[PDB]
Amino acid sequence: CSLDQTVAPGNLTLCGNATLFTTFRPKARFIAPEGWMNAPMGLYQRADGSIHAGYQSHPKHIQWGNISQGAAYSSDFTSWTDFNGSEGYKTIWPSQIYDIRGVFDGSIIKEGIDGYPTILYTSTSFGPLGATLNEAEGTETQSLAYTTDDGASWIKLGYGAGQNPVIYEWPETNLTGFRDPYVFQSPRLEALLANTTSITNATGDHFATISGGVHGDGARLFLYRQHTTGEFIKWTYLGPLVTTGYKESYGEWSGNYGINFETAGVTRLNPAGAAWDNGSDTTAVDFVTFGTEQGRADHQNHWPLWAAVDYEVRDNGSIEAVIAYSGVQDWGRSYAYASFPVEGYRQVSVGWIYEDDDNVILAKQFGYQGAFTLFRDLFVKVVENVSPSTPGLFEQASWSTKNSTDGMSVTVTTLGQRVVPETLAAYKGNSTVSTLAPVMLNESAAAYTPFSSQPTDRFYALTGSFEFGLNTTAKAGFRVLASEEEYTDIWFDPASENLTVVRTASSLIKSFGNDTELAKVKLYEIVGAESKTLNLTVFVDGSVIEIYANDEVALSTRAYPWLANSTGAGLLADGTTAGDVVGVSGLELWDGLVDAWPARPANTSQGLVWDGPTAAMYGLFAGY
Amino acid sequence: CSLDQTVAPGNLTLCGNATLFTTFRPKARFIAPEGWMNAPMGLYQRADGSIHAGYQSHPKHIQWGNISQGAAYSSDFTSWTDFNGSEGYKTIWPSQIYDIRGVFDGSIIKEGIDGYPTILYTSTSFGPLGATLNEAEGTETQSLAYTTDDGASWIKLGYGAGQNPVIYEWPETNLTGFRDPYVFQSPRLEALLANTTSITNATGDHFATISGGVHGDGARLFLYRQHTTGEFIKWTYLGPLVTTGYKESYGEWSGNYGINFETAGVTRLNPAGAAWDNGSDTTAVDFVTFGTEQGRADHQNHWPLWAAVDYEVRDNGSIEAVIAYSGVQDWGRSYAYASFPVEGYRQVSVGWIYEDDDNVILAKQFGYQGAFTLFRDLFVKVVENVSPSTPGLFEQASWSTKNSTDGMSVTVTTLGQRVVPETLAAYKGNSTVSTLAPVMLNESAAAYTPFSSQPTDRFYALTGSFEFGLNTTAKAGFRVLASEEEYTDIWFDPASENLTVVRTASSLIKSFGNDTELAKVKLYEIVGAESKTLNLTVFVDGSVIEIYANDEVALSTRAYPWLANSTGAGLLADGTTAGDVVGVSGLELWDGLVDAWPARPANTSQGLVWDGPTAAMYGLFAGY
């Protein structure tokens, strides 16, 4: 095993465990110290204002198993510190008959058991578990634990009658899944149900959704309500909140609803951020965010979606969330988005970016798998004075339209996402910032034009505004992680409305994924404008490429170039002419970003272990 | 619920949990503080000379489940003190994927991991588990833990390759069971295998048996040898030590070998006690003790047996234990005997006495189930100068015979059992002792003759020597726990060779078992004697009646009389005449015995709990 990044890569499968630990590793984002991670969990703002982030964790392994909560904290979403206790950076782990198969996703009741922060999580036991298997009741239940030390440790309620698990009965038969309890307060839902509480007797101030579906009949999000305020054992099933069809799709802008939901959450937003009104705010919109399974041919069969919903009260004292419009939270290799409330009327969302090594060829050599996305403020994005001749505008697919009185302009409403400002400020302030001169892309434009200043490593951010003619057929964007032989191309093509990431040349190492990523982006044309603009922000962080367009469209993906000098970046141009020009302005390179884990050394591997021959006997975990 | 023991019992099923806690409860023996107990486990003499006793334990329940090691200690086998730690009196409990279904029986390596006492135990996980089910590999494995604090706590080795569990591969397919590792040193087996160690490479100084069987083809005791001295991970399967047939019986004196072994152990004894020679002691005999399942119509389908064996070395470097003669360790409601070495060349054996409430009618009202037997010294019982006209003597069923040179006398050899002398001394010294005048039972004998001194409660011991004519048809014995309306009759009938416990009148409460207990006892007639003698010792301890005959035959059973005055005792006589007389001598009553748990209050119940609806979902434990 040679680690010479000045020549072509050898057979890297001969390299030892964690020998490629630093080679492709993100430095500027949330990631476990080592080993396997997946979904964010247990997210909450602590009493001191800091952020507690949990995650599904399997230390010293590179596949899922014995799934536990790893945890860390931060005062700014950006610079983090690991917890360190008797189980290292773990704070909840399989320990009881009811959760021995895995401590799955859970969410936080801030004022819970004895007034302490309390997690409601999916406790798993034995038996077939999965949307395509014949799962039985009891395999997935929901259990409580609380912390007396601000997340350094958690104490589970005892096992038994009137204790853990607290939710165990399936609300309907033949479930495809029954997990990921999302606990939330909702003045909105309380107001809607206030006249029906005699029917159910559920009067608590916390609601909980559980994600799943029904075999052969599509996904389901089940709504529970805390039976009595201040009491956390009894949760009353109201009814299905979201019901979708078996592999139903709302269309090209909306992914596919698959057969089963995972990590679903419920929020209410307005243009500024989180909305906590009872329905009285006419600018507020109710949203559900959710993953779906088995409705996608690639990306691990997983869509991270969202939907704007209108709540209707059923006669039995439950709520139907009727989907008004439906979109995609991220178009690339990410999933398991969780959102949580943050002080100052914010709702912040974060997901998991998986690797692109689905055949597990170099996972052991990495010594880790997975990272988070960046943390994102959610809000209602409102675009005013939109031209009615914007192509496809009245499809109203992942947005809504309201006509002006005179019919000459439209107000567009959709889900907004933007990187939390704490991270943008810290990134910029710790980077070497190059403000670049605007570039007009015309007949003289090369295919690729390097920026006048270049990155020094694989940790940087790019921004640019691309102004296109209303009838352009030109394409433009950014090339990143680029040398002569390796590069990743991010293109926008207004004619097709497609943002793509072409990865055919991303790496000389042939075992990584190389499929082209694709997102739809609607450039809402403004009344009186003779052009349309794409604002593109790109974060390059080890192997992560995370793309944001117009504070709306997100696409996370992976690139693993071998050569040490595959770090360059610049502008891409295709079919730009004297007549069909693309004006690029607001160009800026931030080189360096932030060291997100300042207390960690460069190599936090502790080696990898094998569970031994019993792993196959038990049949629950891969074992490595 | 009335607790008036001066009148007939009401409907006791209306009584609350643990309301009958003290009513029938033993006071003078090893018993858990409350709840369910079964098999002794983890038995060893500690460095300070005290005895550590573990037991299968399910606190706050009255059926088996979440099975754990409860523990206590004693300097004299007789007066005990509970451990008290973070889990009360438990010291090992289900905590890992490999043992989450139960910490089953295990035994002690005195100089184990890092020189500490170390337990090898059966770690159980999910799946069908049982001799009549389709069990699969992995459900029962064998794991290690060690103690740095003389049994107050145990530290398990980690889960994984080269760690726990240390034995997981089934030595043959379609096992009925794979549990109860019994670790022992054996100069005998080492000498026998010394010429074959090239074939197996196993040269360690510890052996281990694992108890089981093969579906459709009878029980098996599998022999393993520690691969290397001072190393505890690698154990090498040599071969089957004991192989018996599907429900094979050696006859009327030997129970039935059933379909599966449990709690089997291996020892070597001589007339004085334990023998640690390499084979050079011609007075020493190799013994296996073992439980069998599904070879009995009652007593929970369970026989506690023993066999004298002659070891043969196989060509593949393993040992066949050929059964020479075969007997019964206890004929009544006991099972799961364990033996362990004790200083001064002793091997001490102790078992579990279950209740006689198999339909679980008053278990909750008790608030506990189970106790130990008394602790018993094992030795080779030798009877010299036996008359060749002793009926049935050359059947050699659970004994051996060697003729004198002249053929006029026989030496009989069998397994001896007697209560450890520490317990007999403590019992006698703490009791009010009445030495009773000898009684000749003839034509004047009533059916029942009370002793001249009577017990004051349900805690006493009786002794007597019953001298019978060689052709008697008379029966005699002891009545215990007796009032006019309730009593338990212990009869010996030399003509049939049957010792019986008749329990048709044991209690006015009709839900308890009332079947007649039966043991075979061979009165070895001595050359020149004109009579034959039965030495009977009986312990009455709450509901336990534990009977010993001639330091050989043991029979443990249960009686639950309701009336406060059903405590009396005396002599039984049937068919005694002027000509057929039974001479009773050596009569003694010990009233009171010992308070075996002096630090415990009278009521150590902590209440009972229900596991809730998930118990049936998981399907592993009853849940109460």
Ligand SMILES: *[C@@H]1O[C@H](CO)[C@@H](O[C@@H]2O[C@H](CO)[C@@H](O[C@@H]3O[C@H](CO[C@H]4O[C@H](CO[C@H]5O[C@H](CO)[C@@H](O)[C@H](O)[C@@H]5O[C@H]5O[C@H](CO)[C@@H](O)[C@H](O)[C@@H]5O)[C@@H](O)[C@H](O[C@H]5O[C@H](CO)[C@@H](O)[C@H](O)[C@@H]5O)[C@@H]4O)[C@@H](O)[C@H](O[C@H]4O[C@H](CO)[C@@H](O)[C@H](O)[C@@H]4O[C@H]4O[C@H](CO)[C@@H](O)[C@H](O)[C@@H]4O[C@H]4O[C@H](CO)[C@@H](O)[C@H](O)[C@@H]4O)[C@@H]3O)[C@H](O)[C@H]2NC(C)=O)[C@H](O)[C@H]1NC(C)=O
């Ligand atoms: C199979 O068997 C298994 C083993 O038995 C069994 O698992 C066990 O289940 C039991 C029962 O559910 C659990 O017991 C609970 O424990 C809770 C605390 O748990 C935390 O702490 C313990 C102990 O920690 C000590 O010891 C450890 C280990 O040595 C040390 O490392 C610690 O530092 C600490 O040491 C100190 O203390 C020791 C003495 O205890 C000293 O020896 C030592 O020197 C130190 O000073 C840990 O072991 C736990 O760890 C385990 O669990 C965590 C997850 O929780 C895992 O991550 C970890 O790996 C371990 O597995 C853990 O950290 C108790 O809080 C709880 O007691 C309460 O509940 C019961 C009711 O259920 C009440 O009876 C009791 O009164 C308590 O309730 C009161 O208190 C709470 C708040 O404190 C209130 O909310 C509540 O209302 C109530 O208040 C009452 O009193 C108030 C007055 O004070 C009053 O105001 C109120 O009005 C009210 O009256 C309970 O004891 C046990 O932890 C499990 N153990 C393990 C190892 O799993 C399993 O379930 C069985 N399975 C089946 C299928 O049956």
Ligand SMILES: *[C@@H]1O[C@H](CO)[C@@H](O[C@@H]2O[C@H](CO)[C@@H](O[C@@H]3O[C@H](CO[C@H]4O[C@H](CO[C@H]5O[C@H](CO)[C@@H](O)[C@H](O)[C@@H]5O[C@H]5O[C@H](CO)[C@@H](O)[C@H](O)[C@@H]5O)[C@@H](O)[C@H](O[C@H]5O[C@H](CO)[C@@H](O)[C@H](O)[C@@H]5O)[C@@H]4O)[C@@H](O)[C@H](O[C@H]4O[C@H](CO)[C@@H](O)[C@H](O)[C@@H]4O[C@H]4O[C@H](CO)[C@@H](O)[C@H](O)[C@@H]4O[C@H]4O[C@H](CO)[C@@H](O)[C@H](O)[C@@H]4O)[C@@H]3O)[C@H](O)[C@H]2NC(C)=O)[C@H](O)[C@H]1NC(C)=O
């Ligand atoms: C799913 O995830 C699960 C959770 O991660 C996982 O279970 C965990 O598995 C790991 C890995 O196997 C276990 O880790 C081992 O722990 C052993 C000790 O275990 C005992 O102590 C711990 C910790 O106790 C502290 O904390 C608790 C809880 O708060 C307190 O109550 C205690 O009082 C104590 O607190 C003090 O210390 C804390 C810091 O740790 C402080 O915070 C605190 O302030 C106090 O000061 C307990 O938690 C354990 O309890 C659990 O387990 C018991 C059964 O064992 C249960 O009954 C109970 O309910 C709990 O479940 C327990 O009591 C370690 O000994 C062990 O470390 C050794 O092994 C590894 C190799 O495997 C080596 O890397 C390491 O070096 C150690 O080996 C050396 O040392 C031993 C002797 O000590 C030697 O024999 C050995 O050769 C070696 O020697 C070396 O060094 C020498 C120099 O010193 C040198 O001479 C030699 O040459 C050599 O080089 C390991 O860390 C962990 O316990 C499990 N946890 C739980 C909760 O289950 C599970 O397996 C996963 N499942 C799957 C399927 O994957």
Ligand SMILES: *[C@@H]1O[C@H](CO)[C@@H](O[C@@H]2O[C@H](CO)[C@@H](O[C@@H]3O[C@H](CO[C@H]4O[C@H](CO)[C@@H](O)[C@H](O[C@H]5O[C@H](CO)[C@@H](O)[C@H](O)[C@@H]5O)[C@@H]4O)[C@@H](O)[C@H](O[C@H]4O[C@H](CO)[C@@H](O)[C@H](O)[C@@H]4O[C@@H]4O[C@H](CO)[C@@H](O)[C@H](O)[C@@H]4O)[C@@H]3O)[C@H](O)[C@H]2NC(C)=O)[C@H](O)[C@H]1NC(C)=O
């Ligand atoms: C005395 O000690 C007991 C512990 O032994 C302790 O707890 C009680 O334990 C008993 C079992 O011994 C439990 O009985 C079972 O109850 C089930 C129904 O339970 C529901 O109704 C109850 C009555 O109002 C409620 O009290 C229950 O509430 C508790 O539990 C819920 C969780 O479900 C919790 O949220 C609450 O907070 C409470 O803690 C609950 O709503 C019965 O289904 C179960 O019935 C079976 O067993 C009976 C007896 O054999 C049979 O009559 C039935 O036919 C059925 O049995 C069959 O069982 C066989 C073998 O199991 C099987 O093959 C068949 O399929 C079928 O199941 C049983 O009756 C009792 O619920 C529980 N009470 C609790 C937790 O409060 C007591 O509390 C303790 N007393 C005191 C004063 O301390």
Ligand SMILES: *[C@@H]1O[C@H](CO)[C@@H](O[C@@H]2O[C@H](CO)[C@@H](O[C@@H]3O[C@H](CO[C@H]4O[C@H](CO)[C@@H](O)[C@H](O[C@H]5O[C@H](CO)[C@@H](O)[C@H](O)[C@@H]5O)[C@@H]4O)[C@@H](O)[C@H](O[C@H]4O[C@H](CO)[C@@H](O)[C@H](O)[C@@H]4O[C@@H]4O[C@H](CO)[C@@H](O)[C@H](O)[C@@H]4O)[C@@H]3O)[C@H](O)[C@H]2NC(C)=O)[C@H](O)[C@H]1NC(C)=O
């Ligand atoms: C680097 O990190 C690893 C942890 O990832 C760590 O431990 C090693 O982990 C790998 C897995 O990643 C283990 O490989 C497996 O080994 C099995 C055979 O193992 C036996 O032979 C080995 C070779 O000499 C021995 O080293 C082993 O000894 C150890 O374990 C025993 C317990 O068994 C213990 O007593 C010892 O003390 C040692 O700890 C052992 O005797 C293979 O069966 C298994 O093979 C499968 O997977 C391969 C790779 O994909 C395939 O080629 C095979 O076809 C087969 O895979 C198929 O798998 C799929 C999915 O699993 C399934 O559908 C099929 O049925 C089939 O199974 C695999 O190769 C390795 O044993 C283990 N080594 C250990 C513990 O020492 C390394 O130690 C670490 N390195 C360093 C330097 O730290």
Ligand SMILES: *[C@@H]1O[C@H](CO)[C@@H](O)[C@H](O)[C@H]1NC(C)=O
């Ligand atoms: C980058 O490195 C490769 C291999 O060392 C080399 O061929 C190339 O010329 C280098 N410089 C570039 C692409 O600017």
Ligand SMILES: *[C@@H]1O[C@H](CO)[C@@H](O)[C@H](O)[C@H]1NC(C)=O
């Ligand atoms: C890479 O090495 C592996 C052994 O780890 C070997 O099986 C494989 O064929 C090698 N690839 C080549 C030579 O291209």
Ligand SMILES: *[C@@H]1O[C@H](CO)[C@@H](O)[C@H](O)[C@H]1NC(C)=O
């Ligand atoms: C569907 O549900 C019932 C239990 O409610 C169960 O008997 C059945 O096996 C389930 N699965 C299928 C494939 O029908």
Ligand SMILES: *[C@@H]1O[C@H](CO)[C@@H](O)[C@H](O)[C@H]1NC(C)=O
């Ligand atoms: C309430 O009604 C809805 C619609 O029929 C149904 O899906 C839900 O299960 C009902 N809730 C119950 C039975 O608790």
Ligand SMILES: *[C@@H]1O[C@H](CO)[C@@H](O)[C@H](O)[C@H]1NC(C)=O
């Ligand atoms: C919205 O505006 C467009 C263009 O002016 C028009 O075609 C459409 O009918 C209008 N919708 C409503 C509800 O007035």
Ligand SMILES: *[C@@H]1O[C@H](CO)[C@@H](O)[C@H](O)[C@H]1NC(C)=O
């Ligand atoms: C650098 O990053 C840290 C950690 O996020 C942040 O607190 C600090 O303000 C940044 N430095 C600047 C903006 O100069």
Ligand SMILES: *[C@@H]1O[C@H](CO)[C@@H](O)[C@H](O)[C@H]1NC(C)=O
């Ligand atoms: C065409 O592009 C080049 C490079 O940006 C620029 O120098 C030139 O001015 C552009 N042409 C026009 C007409 O603006």
Ligand SMILES: *[C@@H]1O[C@H](CO)[C@@H](O)[C@H](O)[C@H]1NC(C)=O
């Ligand atoms: C743009 O994307 C869609 C998928 O939404 C695809 O069907 C279409 O062919 C693409 N068009 C072009 C020109 O790339």
Ligand SMILES: *[C@@H]1O[C@H](CO)[C@@H](O)[C@H](O)[C@H]1NC(C)=O
């Ligand atoms: C024993 O008690 C019962 C009921 O109180 C009574 O009938 C009997 O005479 C008492 N005394 C005896 C049997 O000596």
Ligand SMILES: *[C@@H]1O[C@H](CO)[C@@H](O)[C@H](O)[C@H]1NC(C)=O
């Ligand atoms: C017997 O053994 C094999 C595995 O060795 C297994 O396939 C089979 O199902 C077992 N049980 C029966 C009843 O044959």
Ligand SMILES: *[C@@H]1O[C@H](CO)[C@@H](O)[C@H](O)[C@H]1NC(C)=O
């Ligand atoms: C040794 O031989 C015996 C008798 O054939 C056999 O039962 C045992 O399994 C053998 N041991 C092995 C294969 O390790």
Ligand SMILES: *[C@@H]1O[C@H](CO)[C@@H](O)[C@H](O)[C@H]1NC(C)=O
């Ligand atoms: C043992 O003694 C009996 C009676 O004297 C006799 O029948 C039998 O043959 C003797 N056995 C041997 C082996 O000599």
